[PDB]
Design a protein around this ligand. Structure first.
Ligand SMILES: NC(=O)c1ccc[n+]([C@@H]2O[C@H](COP(=O)([O-])OP(=O)(O)OC[C@H]3O[C@@H](n4cnc5c(N)ncnc54)[C@H](O)[C@@H]3O)[C@@H](O)[C@H]2O)c1
Ligand SMILES: NC(=O)c1ccc[n+]([C@@H]2O[C@H](COP(=O)([O-])OP(=O)(O)OC[C@H]3O[C@@H](n4cnc5c(N)ncnc54)[C@H](O)[C@@H]3O)[C@@H](O)[C@H]2O)c1
Ligand SMILES: NC(=O)c1ccc[n+]([C@@H]2O[C@H](COP(=O)([O-])OP(=O)(O)OC[C@H]3O[C@@H](n4cnc5c(N)ncnc54)[C@H](O)[C@@H]3O)[C@@H](O)[C@H]2O)c1
Ligand SMILES: NC(=O)c1ccc[n+]([C@@H]2O[C@H](COP(=O)([O-])OP(=O)(O)OC[C@H]3O[C@@H](n4cnc5c(N)ncnc54)[C@H](O)[C@@H]3O)[C@@H](O)[C@H]2O)c1
Ligand SMILES: Nc1ncnc2[nH]cnc12
Ligand SMILES: Nc1ncnc2[nH]cnc12
Ligand SMILES: [K+]
Ligand SMILES: [K+]
Ligand SMILES: [K+]
Ligand SMILES: [K+]
Lengths: 462, 461, 461, 462
């Protein structure tokens, strides 16, 4: 009834959005179980959550779970290209403040985050933070420190965001306790790997409709994202090569059946054209960055690529690829939104029939969300169940109400306990129809565990 | 006139040496350590009791320890795992070894006894290398005095580590130990990729069965279960996975496996009634990978599809209720380590009976029992970790510390990540892989040294 | 001012031409044909009625036929397969095209008639390019006189080749045809690898469902069933395969699939009691690939697990008994070409009902309906064969022969192996593959020319 | 006892052989189905079959199906290394003439074939021939042409053997009709492909116990054996490159996710050291030949292979590899039977620790049979049910008794009808517990087939 506290691309997409949310709910049994077990207890009664994460249909089920458990929220997306407009619209239509649309400008992105922080032109009395990448965390610490005084914690979604949180902690600049949601196994070894397995080839097909089978790929990185990216491409029949700086991850790539190569002769990146292994890069049809590092597909690499190669990044930020070099030197031709040919013939214009171009997806931004719809609902079930648990926990601990001395002892970056990790997994497994075996008392004795778990020591790597 | 050994057949030594020479080219991390430290002789003074599968790969581990100055006395940690030509080759070089493929339990206990006793008295051992904890166990139970001279234990495998931790918890562990299993260049290399290579290998050698198109059930989805499922799936088996750990079960689903229990609703009540007879009646092959007890029990064995293959790839045979099969069913030996278990009864059997199971390696570790275990280039990582672990604890000299300092170091520890990385680098180079070096700006960006380590200790890979 | 066409949106031409220029770089066999033949204008005088999915790939084919001298009038062979930016680009180049995504059945037949009729009279067509046999059928039945001027038909797909042979068998085929489907660079490329690429693509775009860990049932294991099963298995689906052909079933077993039937003992007696309700109740996704009628029937649909996805990738939508569902169940459009079918009845539905199926593309070709069909680099094979077949038959001038000579020329044939190999060579070079040339001695050894053909006509690849 | 008409390695191996035959019977339901359906009618009564094919456990079941149908046989192996000594022994212990053992010499090999052809010094009154590779066919036509007057047919198992029959037919030198067993679908596209998938990596593991994952393989040829060989290595995690002279098979390898390469620069094999791709071959850890052609792993390739590469051939004849060159120039070190280190440092002796060697399996003979046991029972079931049906047909046609005018009409090389092919596959499928669906009349009518089949036109490629 006269709700206006939102900004989306097209409110008339709400019904489409509601139809997809009702479907996603059937794909997210851990989340919906959290709704059922906790709705009547309202464990988030009083929570006022600032949320900054891809405004997908999946995020929308996360949002309505938080709201169903009593929280108020104000929401923005953490990438300019990751929002699904029908999901944004549906969340707005439900009366939840949201500021998000696919294809924002950098200025619009920053404006959207401020709309969650500011209500009626002043700071919202927020007390919780949910983040994916650290951008909202950053603007709170740098621009609105007084707001953190009233905030109980941050539940942080992804690898890069966690890295920034730990840097602040080691520098004494983190102001509130955080939960590392990324490092739950039902997140990092679910979302980060299998999710990219599902969505990377999906995004490339939608952007280019390129045949992948029999073509040559180079994946930069073999962490969780690189593992699943490599799989996404190999299961399509690509000849996949992997680069790494970490010899352990490189060992895994070898054992998984990949050839480990470096873009630089002898792996030495001295900044010269001559250090590029030009013979290797001239063979590559597709390069994907997965590192969370800076400039791992650099300007010389881009100069050396096979004509018409595809270039994309599935790490969290776009600075994995020297796209700025490309804007400075090469003419860009939009094929369609989030697909650009970059003509290496020069800056001022281009020949429509030039064969010396590259195809860049989503302008170097996260490609699975930029050119497709990111991870599927049933994978995001695990990540977003971890989020809800982390919110309940930090909100219950009321860090913001401690004396300065208790705050000091209490400031930390923690992970969810294994028992909760295990319980999230059980619901995911049940979602597939899987049937977990129950230990007998003698067996639980024999391996020194409780029949209900945990089943592994905290040191276990899975 | 060297006689301080017992093997099946010394004339196999030349064959074993030829195979040892090949393995050294397949093991760059291990050989790199042999070359790096031979000059220092960092194990000079060490007297290592070793108990681990006497394979060609173990032979390269053994000669490395010796090249770094150690004395050793060796046995196998399993009655079926020895490669007789590896055993022979070692003995022929004057290294005390007591091992043959096909031992009895009584012979197995004697072989360990021979490493412990020298000329009828306890050898002045000061180090232990163990796979599974059997040698750790006999020392603590029958020769506790010897542990006063021992500086530590380097334990190879999951089951062994678990056993060390239980002693630690209970206050019964007498010397410190390194958990070699949990290096990433071991657990996520040996335990997974090793079983991927060697499980289907062993099934083919024992039965020469086609695997494609048939139904498998793998009990467990830890590192050995993940690897074992892949061994079968890549051959075209339709693989189902059983697990008690929901996180591991979640991985199995995501990896494209159906997760099932042998019991209805996953609840074992010890009766035939709780068996999923319909599930088990369709299973062509069952593989135990758990390190737990009785995970292929008697009722399961009664319900299995006629002519199913039964085997275990965890450390100990009690994963399968073979005792029950020995009590009630007649065993027909096909060839060594391959038995038909005729479910028609105890006294005798019909040569053409169709109601049998096939048991590989009488339920012992099947990859070692029916083939040669892991390939040299995988063991390379495990055994380089072992050497580094031996060098560490030998240099600590725990047995010479005063009590209060002993109390500080009485623990089960893992190798530092820097070392784990260094082993991995040598392995990657073995494949011709090329690792990229970080630039100074890039290393500053992700907060690591250009030289590593590259991940926090929490990282799971 | 060119007005002889009808498309969804002519202002999409520029986007279509960008995608056409990209797709030319993905189609070396086809663009090679422009180069070898555009100087000789072998299709000069050709007037081709073309009816095939109006995609970016069809656009490149279309423009290649024109570059070699042909006039064309074009429609699509499916109501949902058109890409509108392609139709727009072709229109804007001055080529008669009648096609948009989401036509009705009435509009579909209208669109075909606008190719046949020009200024309200029969076009003076002399060639046919068809995919599925719909254009062919309307000529023989409604405009038989136009065939007296037509030299031949080049038919794209398995279903249409079957219809042609039905006519050749009955003596009702009026002009000769090339069976383009049965080129190896077509059937074993397009039918198989095209569906591998494009089936999971279309399901992702339709539903965004995770496929890993879910249960699929693929009906059929011909070339489309092979590709589709791989499309799902490589995503981590647990795939079951149904077949009526024991040879194709044997391949599915050997490929690592469990072969099952929707019916007990495989006997479809038309009753609910014949349905394997346990199997169907576990299936998360069902895919029809047979080219047969009603292989996903009403009782299977009643028995499917709640929220199962239902789709067909065979040429014609009668593979699925959608008429049953239209008669008995309420349909909720999720978005275009995605429908929840609420099995609670016909009189409306509950928005939060859980007993529904999801139908893609209303049972029409799902890869073209919910994505974009095969990728350019695969269609390259198919469409090089099409172009070559057009030259073959046009240079043959069958319509100018006397009846007694027509009789001897009236057939359904495939391209000679040599052309098949030439297309394949160009496809291989597109990947950067390097074919090895035989030595004269080697060629003599195996009994072939150094230039090929390399296999006897009986060879199955 | 009393019966002495055989020569095997060790007769005491008979009991172990019998045990493996009994197992194999349960793995071969088509063969044992044939045995049950026809033992009563005795369709092979009076047949006298010269058999020449790898004396494995699988061949033993085949031999005993024929005997069970009324035939007498006299048997040798078609390869010097392929016999299973316990199978040979079990067969001779059953009272069946067999002349076969693992590790024959060339002189001994032809002696064994001769011992099947002669009984008591005079030619045996044979009247049927079962061959694998055409060697038996070749000795009969060259050296005992009179015996062919009494012989009703040849049933030929393999591609090389079929090629040789067609060339004799074209030349007018083939004296009796033949059935091409290789080209049943339940043979070619089962045995030739899936058989090698099972048995290639099997043989390499038994010979060397080498890790295959992460290493570089080069497969020469991508026919049925090539397709199966490549899959055998790739499923182990090898990085596999494929070479081919047929562009259609090369197109399949690309789409199958393989890089297609040639050992020669630009594919051009002109016999020069300069034509070799030294860079490529210096990266190859394993080369497998699958072609049925001659010298496809030649001297210069052997010179250029990466130190310690493994070299093996899975084609029928060992001349795919230039082993004669290696015998002439390099020193062979036997690791164990059928495993040789070939020291490229010279011919006269070697350094025991030389690093510059190749590993040659089975001395270049069929590696799956030389170093392991060839195909598994359940695959050979398809090949060998075809063989039995083929024998029944040609023995019943009584070609050798027909008038000359009818001989000329029936002198051909034929394949089995598709209906029998389908019936073989049905038994196979059933052996896996697969359930084949029955068409309804309406459906049968709609695709124009009978409900009983055949279900495909003869042009169908599967
Ligand atoms: N798009 C998505 O849906 C999604 C999902 C999860 C995470 N992510 C993001 O992806 C990135 C990687 O995440 P992760 O979980 O895989 O982290 P990770 O630490 O597990 O792996 C990144 C890897 O990159 C390697 N690397 C770093 N610099 C390199 C260089 N110069 N060359 C080659 N390799 C190099 C590191 O050794 C490391 O193994 C992060 O930005 C994370 O936030 C994206
Ligand atoms: N054969 C070999 O070469 C080899 C190599 C390494 C380790 N191992 C042995 O294999 C065993 C497993 O080792 P791991 O490293 O995989 O250990 P792990 O802890 O990683 O895996 C064991 C798994 O079994 C599961 N499990 C336990 N009881 C179960 C039950 N009743 N039903 C189903 N699943 C059950 C656990 O949840 C766990 O995931 C140990 O005995 C280990 O020492 C053998
Ligand atoms: N969508 C696409 O892009 C595309 C591409 C090529 C062909 N097609 C179409 O797909 C269909 C199949 O083509 P194909 O080349 O694979 O034909 P095919 O003859 O190779 O295979 C069809 C298979 O279905 C099996 N089958 C028939 N009735 C069955 C039943 N009731 N139950 C189970 N299995 C049954 C047959 O035994 C046969 O093996 C045809 O309509 C063809 O025109 C579609
Ligand atoms: N070891 C086994 O168990 C087994 C089983 C079946 C057949 N075979 C034998 O293996 C061989 C191959 O049989 P197949 O059925 O695959 O035959 P095939 O005709 O289908 O395949 C052989 C392939 O080799 C290719 N080729 C020829 N010369 C080449 C060259 N110089 N470089 C690269 N590729 C080249 C051909 O193009 C062809 O595709 C024959 O000798 C056959 O009898 C062995
Ligand atoms: N679909 C999705 N929704 C939210 N965050 C995501 N991160 C990756 N995929 C995502
Ligand atoms: N096991 C086997 N027996 C007979 N012939 C074969 N050809 C390939 N493998 C074989
Ligand atoms: K999604
Ligand atoms: K080994
Ligand atoms: K397309
Ligand atoms: K065999």
């Amino acid at each position: 009834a006269g709700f206006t506290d939102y900004k989306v691309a097209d409110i008339t997409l709400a019904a489409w959005g509601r139809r997809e949310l009702i479907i996603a709910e059937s794909e997210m049994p851990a989340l919906m179980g959290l709704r059922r077990k906790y709705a009547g207890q309202q464990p988030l009664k009083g929570a006022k959550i600032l949320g900054c994460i891809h405004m997908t249909i999946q995020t929308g089920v996360l949002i309505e779970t938080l709201v169903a458990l009593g929280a108020e929220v104000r929401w923005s997306s953490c990438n300019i290209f990751s929002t699904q407009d029908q999901a944004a619209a549906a969340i707005a239509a439900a009366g939840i403040p949201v500021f998000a649309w696919k294809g924002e400008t950098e200025e619009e992105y920053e404006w959207c985050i401020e709309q969650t922080i500011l209500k009626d032109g002043q700071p919202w009395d927020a007390n919780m933070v949910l983040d994916d990448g650290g951008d909202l965390t950053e603007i709170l610490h740098k621009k609105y420190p007084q707001m953190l005084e009233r905030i109980h914690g941050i539940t942080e979604e992804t690898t890069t965001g966690v890295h920034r949180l730990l840097d602040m902690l080691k520098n004494g600049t983190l102001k509130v306790p955080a939960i590392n949601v990324n490092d739950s196994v039902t997140k990092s070894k679910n979302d980060n790997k299998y999710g990219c397995r599902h969505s990377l080839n999906d995004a490339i097909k939608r952007g280019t409709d390129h045949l992948l089978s029999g073509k040559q790929a180079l994946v930069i990185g073999y962490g969780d994202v690189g593992k699943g990216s490599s799989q996404s491409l190999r299961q399509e029949g690509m000849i996949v090569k992997v680069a790494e700086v970490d010899p352990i991850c490189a060992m895994q790539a070898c054992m998984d059946g990949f050839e480990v190569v470096s873009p630089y002769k002898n792996g030495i990146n001295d900044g010269t054209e001559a250090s590029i292994d030009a013979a290797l890069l001239g063979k590559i049809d597709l390069i994907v960055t997965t590192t969370g590092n800076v400039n791992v597909c650099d300007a010389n690499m881009l100069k050396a690529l096979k004509k018409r190669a595809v270039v994309c990044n599935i790490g969290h930020f776009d600075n994995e690829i020297d796209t700025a070099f490309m804007r400075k030197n090469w003419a860009w031709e939009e094929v369609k939104p989030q697909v650009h040919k970059i003509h290496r013939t020069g800056k001022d214009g281009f020949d429509a029939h030039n064969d010396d171009y590259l195809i860049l997806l989503a302008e170097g931004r996260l490609v699975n969300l930029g050119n497709a719809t990111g991870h599927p609902s049933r994978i995001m079930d695990g990540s977003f169940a971890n989020q809800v648990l982390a919110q309940i926990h930090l909100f219950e601990q009321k860090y913001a109400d401690l004396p300065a001395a208790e705050k000091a002892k209490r400031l930390s970056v923690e992970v969810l306990p294994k028992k909760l990790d295990e319980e999230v997994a059980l619901e995911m497994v049940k979602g597939f129809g899987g049937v977990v075996t129950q230990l007998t008392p003698k067996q639980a004795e024999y391996i020194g565990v409780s029949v209900e778990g945990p089943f592994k020591p905290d040191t276990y790597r899975y």
